[PDB]
Symmetry: C2
Subunit: 157 residues, 2 copies
């Protein structure tokens, strides 16, 4: 029988990147929450928050096959990035882990949003691309704040 | 005969990102070739070059199922980024497009390099993650140079 479900594969793929995101987030102290590489860039706190919430929305939508969920506003009082990070990483992990293998084949009607329909797997690949994209930026932020010992962009696990 | 048009799917996936990379590269004039967001960061030219060459090596290696190709040094006189970009984007596109669907299942012995064996498809996903990762950084560079009208990080359709 299969050693792992699709869900389990996606979760490992997710974590191989999100773990790095979290390592980077821990290098950001309150003093740099509002750091910006450029005058028109997001603050570090904005960037990190956007990554956590946006991915949660992708997973949430994917899990429930419901496109309306996608732009549902997340209101969270947490304030402390690191705690926020661990909270939403766990919520996101659990959503994905709870999916069946057919769920990944379900078609999502996203014309209203991406102007197109899409398999749940393509949709999740988009969420990954989005996370990897922003993590790349986060790398630049963190070096800008002066940190030089940075993790590999992706974890061997 | 390739029932899944794997190559063709990968190519479309590749281009949906590489096209944005190229749009960004065109916003970089010779005057900013050596721009760096931080004193310890790669220059814009170094970053863009690294993306073009690294991906070419992934594809090259994938196409020929030959791990030795991977760290083969690329020597290129071009100098002009944009031309370099279009040249290597086309070479990369052609390599991937010329692959059969079984090629994507071939196992690559990469212990010497990543300390692990890997399917060609996982290997190509790594190449994509790497491109997306660096394109994220390139976005920070380009805003830093002063450009504010930036493409979406990925082109759909
Ligand atoms: Ni975003
Ligand atoms: Ni790299």
């Amino acid at each position: 029988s299969n050693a792992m479900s699709r869900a389990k594969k996606w979760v490992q793929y997710f974590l191989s990147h999100r773990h790095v995101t979290m390592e980077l987030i821990h290098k950001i102290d309150e003093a740099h929450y509002d750091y910006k590489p450029t005058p028109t860039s997001m603050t570090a706190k904005q960037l990190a928050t956007h990554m956590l919430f946006s991915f949660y929305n992708f997973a949430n939508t994917a899990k429930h096959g419901d496109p309306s969920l996608f732009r549902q506003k997340i209101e969270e009082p947490e304030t402390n990035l690191a705690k926020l990070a661990e909270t939403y990483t766990e919520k996101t992990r659990q959503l994905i882990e709870s999916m069946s293998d057919d769920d990944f084949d379900r078609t999502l009607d996203l014309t209203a949003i991406f102007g197109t329909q899409m398999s749940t797997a393509q949709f999740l690949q988009l969420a990954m691309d989005h996370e990897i994209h922003h993590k790349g930026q986060l790398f630049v932020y963190v070096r800008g704040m002066g940190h030089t010992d940075l993790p590999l962009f992706v974890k061997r696990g």
